[PDB]
Amino acid sequence: RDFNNLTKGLCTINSWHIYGKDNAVRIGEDSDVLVTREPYVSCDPDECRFYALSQGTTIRGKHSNGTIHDRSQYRALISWPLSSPPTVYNSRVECIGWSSTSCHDGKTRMSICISGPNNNASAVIWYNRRPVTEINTWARNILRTQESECVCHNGVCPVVFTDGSATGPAETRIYYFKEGKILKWEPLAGTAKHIEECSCYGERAEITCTCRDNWQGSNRPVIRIDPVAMTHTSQYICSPVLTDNPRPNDPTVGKCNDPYPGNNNNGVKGFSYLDGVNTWLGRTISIASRSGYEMLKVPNALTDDKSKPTQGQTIVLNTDWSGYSGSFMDYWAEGECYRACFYVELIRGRPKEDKVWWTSNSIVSMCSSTEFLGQWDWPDGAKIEYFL
Amino acid sequence: RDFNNLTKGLCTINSWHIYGKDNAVRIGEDSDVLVTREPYVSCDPDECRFYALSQGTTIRGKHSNGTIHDRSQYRALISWPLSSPPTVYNSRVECIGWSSTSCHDGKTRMSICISGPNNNASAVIWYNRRPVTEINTWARNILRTQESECVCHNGVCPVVFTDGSATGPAETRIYYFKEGKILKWEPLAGTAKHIEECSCYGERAEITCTCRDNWQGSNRPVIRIDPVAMTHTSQYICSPVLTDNPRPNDPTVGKCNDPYPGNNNNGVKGFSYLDGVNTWLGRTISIASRSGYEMLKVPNALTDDKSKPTQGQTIVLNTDWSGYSGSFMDYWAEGECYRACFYVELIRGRPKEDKVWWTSNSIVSMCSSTEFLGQWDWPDGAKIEYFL
Amino acid sequence: RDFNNLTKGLCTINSWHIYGKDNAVRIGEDSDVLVTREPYVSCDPDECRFYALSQGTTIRGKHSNGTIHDRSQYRALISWPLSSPPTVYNSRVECIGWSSTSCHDGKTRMSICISGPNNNASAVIWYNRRPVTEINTWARNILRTQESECVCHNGVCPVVFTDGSATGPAETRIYYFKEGKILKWEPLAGTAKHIEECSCYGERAEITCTCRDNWQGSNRPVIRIDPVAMTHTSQYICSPVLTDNPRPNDPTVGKCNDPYPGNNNNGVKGFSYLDGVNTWLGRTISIASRSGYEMLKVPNALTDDKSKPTQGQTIVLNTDWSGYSGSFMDYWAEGECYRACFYVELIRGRPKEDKVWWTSNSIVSMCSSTEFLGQWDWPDGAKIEYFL
Amino acid sequence: RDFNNLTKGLCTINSWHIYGKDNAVRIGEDSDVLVTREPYVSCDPDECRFYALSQGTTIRGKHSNGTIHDRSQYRALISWPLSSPPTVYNSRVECIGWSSTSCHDGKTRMSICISGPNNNASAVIWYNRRPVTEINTWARNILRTQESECVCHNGVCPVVFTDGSATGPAETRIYYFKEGKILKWEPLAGTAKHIEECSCYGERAEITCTCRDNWQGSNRPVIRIDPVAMTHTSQYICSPVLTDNPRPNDPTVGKCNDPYPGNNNNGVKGFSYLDGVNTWLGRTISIASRSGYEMLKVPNALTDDKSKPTQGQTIVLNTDWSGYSGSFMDYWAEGECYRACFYVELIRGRPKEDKVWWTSNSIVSMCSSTEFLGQWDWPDGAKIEYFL
Ligand SMILES: *[C@@H]1O[C@H](CO)[C@@H](O[C@@H]2O[C@H](CO)[C@@H](O[C@@H]3O[C@H](CO[C@H]4O[C@H](CO)[C@@H](O)[C@H](O[C@H]5O[C@H](CO)[C@@H](O)[C@H](O)[C@@H]5O)[C@@H]4O)[C@@H](O)[C@H](O[C@H]4O[C@H](CO)[C@@H](O)[C@H](O)[C@@H]4O[C@H]4O[C@H](CO)[C@@H](O)[C@H](O)[C@@H]4O[C@H]4O[C@H](CO)[C@@H](O)[C@H](O)[C@@H]4O)[C@@H]3O)[C@H](O)[C@H]2NC(C)=O)[C@H](O)[C@H]1NC(C)=O
Ligand SMILES: *[C@@H]1O[C@H](CO)[C@@H](O[C@@H]2O[C@H](CO)[C@@H](O[C@@H]3O[C@H](CO[C@H]4O[C@H](CO)[C@@H](O)[C@H](O[C@H]5O[C@H](CO)[C@@H](O)[C@H](O)[C@@H]5O)[C@@H]4O)[C@@H](O)[C@H](O[C@H]4O[C@H](CO)[C@@H](O)[C@H](O)[C@@H]4O[C@H]4O[C@H](CO)[C@@H](O)[C@H](O)[C@@H]4O[C@H]4O[C@H](CO)[C@@H](O)[C@H](O)[C@@H]4O)[C@@H]3O)[C@H](O)[C@H]2NC(C)=O)[C@H](O)[C@H]1NC(C)=O
Ligand SMILES: *[C@@H]1O[C@H](CO)[C@@H](O[C@@H]2O[C@H](CO)[C@@H](O[C@@H]3O[C@H](CO[C@H]4O[C@H](CO)[C@@H](O)[C@H](O[C@H]5O[C@H](CO)[C@@H](O)[C@H](O)[C@@H]5O)[C@@H]4O)[C@@H](O)[C@H](O[C@H]4O[C@H](CO)[C@@H](O)[C@H](O)[C@@H]4O[C@H]4O[C@H](CO)[C@@H](O)[C@H](O)[C@@H]4O[C@H]4O[C@H](CO)[C@@H](O)[C@H](O)[C@@H]4O)[C@@H]3O)[C@H](O)[C@H]2NC(C)=O)[C@H](O)[C@H]1NC(C)=O
Ligand SMILES: *[C@@H]1O[C@H](CO)[C@@H](O[C@@H]2O[C@H](CO)[C@@H](O[C@@H]3O[C@H](CO[C@H]4O[C@H](CO)[C@@H](O)[C@H](O[C@H]5O[C@H](CO)[C@@H](O)[C@H](O)[C@@H]5O)[C@@H]4O)[C@@H](O)[C@H](O[C@H]4O[C@H](CO)[C@@H](O)[C@H](O)[C@@H]4O[C@H]4O[C@H](CO)[C@@H](O)[C@H](O)[C@@H]4O[C@H]4O[C@H](CO)[C@@H](O)[C@H](O)[C@@H]4O)[C@@H]3O)[C@H](O)[C@H]2NC(C)=O)[C@H](O)[C@H]1NC(C)=O
Ligand SMILES: *[C@@H]1O[C@H](CO)[C@@H](O[C@@H]2O[C@H](CO)[C@@H](O)[C@H](O)[C@H]2NC(C)=O)[C@H](O)[C@H]1NC(C)=O
Ligand SMILES: CC(=O)N[C@@H]1C[C@@H](F)[C@](F)(C(=O)O)O[C@H]1[C@H](O)[C@H](O)CO
Ligand SMILES: CC(=O)N[C@@H]1C[C@@H](F)[C@](F)(C(=O)O)O[C@H]1[C@H](O)[C@H](O)CO
Ligand SMILES: CC(=O)N[C@@H]1C[C@@H](F)[C@](F)(C(=O)O)O[C@H]1[C@H](O)[C@H](O)CO
Ligand SMILES: CC(=O)N[C@@H]1C[C@@H](F)[C@](F)(C(=O)O)O[C@H]1[C@H](O)[C@H](O)CO
Ligand SMILES: [Ca+2]
Ligand SMILES: [Ca+2]
Ligand SMILES: [Ca+2]
Ligand SMILES: [Ca+2]
């Protein structure tokens, strides 16, 4: 009925509780589960759902062979009920393509999918399940977007896109949509040197995005957006607790306005919540590969270049595979504050598990608690040997 | 609540963006996907869906053997959610038969299915999911209809049927339905010599249908219907850009009131949008078989017998299989103009791929953009070898 | 909102058009289709659905072995969308048991299922999907009911039950329910000597049921019920066109008040519409087995002991298997008259096809047309050899 | 719209009629049925559903190997339509974990799931399908709850939890929730010495729970809760008809305020309805293992230490496997009294049937009748040999 406004602050995050888990690869060993990757979670006013990019085959299907590849004509943004797996029979297609974002503005949902060949890709912006706007590639090098939910305020839903090199300067733009129409766009500003795969959340009329500098940085770039003024800025997380992957060992002092060097041309989508002393960072446990996952409480990470952990929680053990991670919240929940949430993609199959010819994932997701809760670890749980 | 009226003109068509794609044959390699053919797309006021004729077996089922055949007691018009595949578990049966059409009038949906033996077929006209009217064969030779959506204006939904020879004169009728009841019917008039499988769209209170002259023409016949007066006329597309299949090579000058000769007794369902300079024609790329698919901008194709392409877009490469194609639009979208859409049926299996014993298809669909978007090609994507 | 009243007469029946067909055995060869028997069709105010008794296993499942048996703890009344097959994933359980009926009163639905051992069976009467009333066996010999829909008038839904011998006198009762509560019951009256499996329809505030005299009659008993007075009578169809199975050859003169002899202790559920000159009878084509199915127009069949066919329609060829048949109508359709409908159960597997270890069926259904439509035949269509 | 109040008494229980049965293990032999255990039934105002703890694999899936284990990261509370089986495609996840409860307060549903390692478990309390409250382990030894529905009165839904030893004193708490928030909690009081797995029902503004004393008692502890005062008491069922399993032979005189000795450190979840002369107890038929199931009418069982059976009903034969059992009622049914209902979990596979590597169950459920109905027995019905 009305556009949602970001009128609340974050709840105090004292730990993380289990929210959803689909066990998709376990279940899909003997049921019609679609192969996916690049999952996320997004809420409507009356339901929260899982989202991902399908590969247009089931996991036991012979067409699962080759699904390490990111971009084909067989991919689509799908959604399905929370903690169910993405099946052929329960998955709803939001739009067609191989990079996406989606968010609800309080009245209805906007979904964006990009498709095409590398040098001629286009975004289609859907609103109320109809296409409304299209945007052609501006740099002819894999036009691409967040791979997790966007955020709206009074109808304005900003979205970050990048077109251009993954290993050098690229052209990043912030589009401000309303009802699927372009109100404005701006080129990236501030000190972030490279942006991909922004993970965003909204509180007190400001949207914060934690992104991936694929080119040089092992610290994460941060974009902060004012959706009323339709302006933004950028920087890096100051903290020496480095949250990209792969990455060097953690130093004692980080960088606020430059990439922290030591690994080039690689990364992973990740997130954080940056809320002064209530600041929590996610990362892989391994510095070398996408294994394990942990949350660290790092007070003032955004602004304090010597900030270190005061608390933490293990989400996935370093002996289990992780993957992309991102933020979402239920903006329509009851109460006085928005409860921080996140997901972690649990990648299985190639390239790390190459006895199978496929790559897919399952999902785990948590939300914050004001209690100090006991921790478990949450692995995918499938046995690869069963698929041989 | 109210009957929809065709009050808008076409949006300007500068390119085509991806709308839906089901990847059904890929997915159906290892899931309970129904064998189909003769698909299309049709919108309700709150949802757009895929439609097709089921063959009453799954593709991996042993009853898929023999599904090259067009007309059996096991066929039905089914619908399913946009870009999902047609599964046993998500497909809704609209009516029983082996030729169909369907459209929503703004209040509810009319669906028409024809069944029976060749010499004794009948149409049943369903409205609000109940049968209302029946029409018996008038020429005793495969009574048959559009195989894509009809169009309504203020409750009046015209439909084109043909009964009689596929390779000689036949008896074509235009029925004007309202609430599933016959208001009137007329015998075909104008200069079209043979009509099958009309593909129709509505704008500014007129309905335009691009059809298949199976007998003689490689140019397509066009029927234009005034749904208020309940009258029509017919002609051929004047343009030397010929759009049937198979067909001769394109000449320099076409025919406005006669079939363009060079192939007899064969054809394929196709479509066009005929809107002066905003005119786009679809066709197979091959002159000999149903391979490839392209859209050509041919200004004034309907009326200019020397009109040639000023722009185009490849939809399916000539090294991939195509099939039937047809028009639809979302008459209930927001904005000032109706956005042209189309689908292409991607036929797999027999007769061209005869290592399998079945014939089925998947679907790809696009809508127009006012941008000049980059093009991809959109093949079915299944590997036949997997099915051996 | 209001209880439906039977205020209309039957439409004129000049032929029969296809209404629904599920092709369940064909589809179930390679999908999760439940084994059933004793199907029927019943309408709500906004939807019509297929109903049957599940056997609590899929057809390809190993538990399909033994499903020739009628009565087990694994059976349930299920419903599913019209012309879909009865799948594990789309079938809704109405109640538990091995004999049933169901009807909608205009406000909500009553469903009745009987379960138990032969000598200690009970009916549970569900209303608005909650159990309301229970009725214990009165004769300790397979309490049993219609196996097709009941009919309501101003909230009163009569139902016919039988308890006692299948091959001798039994105790038949007519229960008058309202909101799932017993208003009254009466013992069978009139001249019918044995009653099973009544097939009923409603018009002009009277309900007519055509039943099965399993003991002696090859003519069918008829019960006529006044749901306002809550009284009834019974007789047999007078016509020499005999409609049970198995049966003797047709004579020239039938019996109005006694069973027509020649076969004992056997029969099949069937139906008719008895409406003076607008009278149509269904029967198997074979006198010996459940093969084929036809509709015969037999003017005044109910009252004229020499009435013979003036018109007919083949539904299933005598070279294809049939089974139970029954009546239903869409009481909530638009227009001035109720359109007669029926289904035929197409039994496959045992005992006639004993290369498989199972018994199941599919469904075909038709409704009347005021046109004289061409006829097709409508077989199950599955190849038993595929299941070996 | 309004919170439900427990304003009715129990209906008179003269027998039990069949309510639901899913036949899940039979069906799951050849369909995508999830492995479960710890099932129950719970009603909303407009629907009643089956609930259980999934094991996050199908039964025919290779991940079914190991599902004898109770607590893993792959478990979730799921619900599905009454008498359907718990499939991958129709099951809705309520929350994540390995111990649960759920109930509807008349406005919306509260669901509670506990997860974590044995020494660090936490409960998350969901309301209106959103997490609201979290509760950390207080004794660091398998925090755990009812495994059947809770009950609400004017918004207050008490829930019994236990944390601590299964074979010695433990710390049991009664939490009083409203809208998912903690109003109050109390430590267990009265004479019950050990509490697990309470099975609860509501009548005349009091909630009665029949639980499992795993430590010493073969008589069942009873907790009675006043949800207005938010106080409770506890005792044991006085009757010498002992209802735990395993258990000693029945004596002539029971114990009201102490555990009845003879078996230690073991038990099974069970239930009763304690309503003076209208008192019925459920139990396994075997004293040694979870086989068979029966209901006994034991007047004044709660308060009369010599009460013996005056009537009974066999539910499952002693030659068939049983399991957990629990109470529920449809608080939103029509009429003057609440109809007592229960389910029995039918465990198949390990440990008793160790030719398979899995453990799962199906469900049977009954409700009371004021008739004296005939009895059947209701086994799971699957053949283990089919799974070899
Ligand atoms: C039941 O559940 C309980 C709740 O989950 C659980 O208690 C939790 O226990 C975990 C695990 O111990 C805690 O997480 C850690 O928290 C550390 C921070 O807390 C310490 O430091 C604070 C400041 O100096 C102290 O205040 C704090 O003391 C307080 O709390 C204590 C309880 O833990 C209590 O005893 C005290 O009385 C007091 O009240 C405490 O001392 C945090 O630092 C740690 O993370 C590091 O360690 C991990 C390995 O264990 C790494 O994976 C992680 O990345 C962090 O280390 C790395 O990064 C650092 C920053 O750069 C570097 O300095 C390190 O060298 C290290 O870097 C290497 O590794 C990196 C990752 O591979 C790499 O990238 C680098 O390159 C380099 O190679 C962890 O998060 C949690 O806070 C506890 N929570 C609560 C509420 O108590 C309890 O144990 C469970 N109970 C049972 C019985 O099982
Ligand atoms: C990123 O995506 C971009 C958007 O898709 C893409 O740009 C697009 O590129 C495609 C492919 O080149 C274009 O499609 C073609 O358009 C042709 C018409 O445009 C030409 O002619 C106009 C009039 O004279 C000119 O105005 C126009 O110039 C303008 O635009 C230029 C850009 O392309 C630009 O450089 C100029 O500066 C200027 O501004 C341009 O010259 C169209 O004619 C063509 O279709 C024919 O060719 C196809 C084969 O390629 C056939 O498949 C097709 O059927 C047509 O040829 C056949 O039919 C004709 C008519 O009868 C016959 O005359 C021909 O002989 C031929 O007939 C044979 O084949 C038939 C089919 O098999 C057969 O039936 C006959 O029997 C006979 O055998 C094609 O549609 C598109 O318009 C571009 N779009 C845009 C917006 O620019 C860009 O390339 C992509 N970028 C990258 C980096 O990959
Ligand atoms: C396109 O579709 C059209 C519509 O479906 C289709 O036309 C239809 O054609 C069918 C098949 O011919 C017709 O069905 C039959 O109708 C018979 C009754 O009609 C005749 O009798 C009337 C009265 O004397 C005449 O009025 C009537 O004449 C009129 O109509 C004619 C068109 O058919 C036309 O030419 C005339 O000008 C005139 O206007 C006509 O002569 C009906 O009797 C028949 O049923 C019997 O025969 C079946 C075998 O074919 C049996 O299966 C069936 O059970 C009936 O016979 C059995 O039972 C009788 C009664 O007891 C016995 O007397 C018989 O001996 C026989 O009994 C044996 O078999 C029993 C069953 O096994 C058994 O139990 C007994 O023991 C014993 O062993 C049939 O229903 C239909 O009416 C036509 N409909 C229309 C609108 O015209 C047209 O053919 C199709 N076109 C093409 C090109 O394919
Ligand atoms: C059609 O369906 C009808 C409805 O279901 C069905 O009739 C029902 O029949 C069943 C089975 O007979 C009845 O259930 C039993 O009811 C017994 C109680 O009723 C008796 O006792 C009363 C009081 O003294 C009498 O009033 C009553 O008489 C009345 O009713 C009669 C009809 O049955 C009628 O003939 C009379 O005229 C009169 O009107 C009647 O005599 C009940 O006691 C019994 O349960 C015990 O027995 C079971 C074994 O059969 C055990 O499994 C069960 O656990 C109970 O015994 C155990 O526990 C007792 C208590 O501690 C011990 O004293 C016993 O020794 C025994 O203990 C051993 O076993 C335990 C379990 O393994 C173990 O833990 C111990 O350690 C020890 O090892 C049973 O529930 C039912 O009430 C009938 N219902 C109705 C309405 O009539 C009819 O039969 C069906 N018809 C056909 C044709 O099939
Ligand atoms: C259950 O009892 C409560 C307490 O008496 C009822 O609560 C009142 O409901 C009315 C009407 O909806 C409100 O206007 C009052 O404010 C409520 N509270 C109190 C404390 O009186 C409630 O309606 C009852 N539930 C049902 C289904 O009748
Ligand atoms: C899932 C897994 O086994 N990850 C291991 C953890 C650890 F042993 C590690 F050394 C690490 O990176 O910390 O290697 C990982 C993994 O085997 C490699 O990094 C990549 O193969
Ligand atoms: C799908 C496909 O391979 N089509 C080819 C394209 C081309 F090579 C062509 F020569 C053509 O017709 O243009 O043959 C098609 C096809 O192999 C035949 O036409 C029919 O088999
Ligand atoms: C389905 C089928 O083949 N039915 C035949 C028809 C006919 F040949 C008939 F002789 C008949 O009864 O009319 O036998 C049936 C069937 O084979 C037997 O009656 C029973 O097996
Ligand atoms: C399902 C089953 O066969 N249960 C039997 C019943 C009975 F024979 C009994 F002796 C009993 O306990 O009463 O053993 C059960 C079962 O075999 C064992 O108790 C445990 O294996
Ligand atoms: Ca990086
Ligand atoms: Ca042609
Ligand atoms: Ca008989
Ligand atoms: Ca015990």
Describe this structure in words.
- Four copies of one chain form a homotetramer.
- With 388 residues, chain A is mainly beta.
- The first copy, chain A, is 1% helix and 42% strand.
- Chain A has one helix and 23 strands.
- Chain A has one helix at residues 24-28; strands at residues 15-21, 34-43, 48-58, 76-81, 92-96, 99-104, 109-115, 122-127, 130-136, 157-164, 170-178, 181-187, 196-203, 206-212, 221-226, 231-236, 272-273, 280-283, 291-297, 311-321, 325-328, 341-349, 359-369.
- In chain A, the strands form six sheets. Chain A has a four-stranded antiparallel beta sheet, with no helix packed on it. A four-stranded antiparallel beta sheet of chain A has the order 2-3-4-5, with no helix packed on it.
- The longest helix of chain A is centred in the first third of the chain and has 5 residues, at 24-28.
- Chain A is globular, with a radius of gyration of 19 Å.
- The N and C termini of chain A lie far apart (51 Å).
- Bound molecules: a molecule of 8 linked components (NAG-NAG-BMA-MAN-MAN-MAN-MAN-MAN) (4 copies), a molecule of 2 linked components (NAG-NAG), the ligand CC(=O)N[C@@H]1C[C@@H](F)[C@](F)(C(=O)O)O[C@H]1[C@H](O)[C@H](O)CO (4 copies) and calcium ion (CA) (4 copies).
- A molecule of 2 linked components (NAG-NAG) is lined by residues 2-5, 106, 154 of chain D.
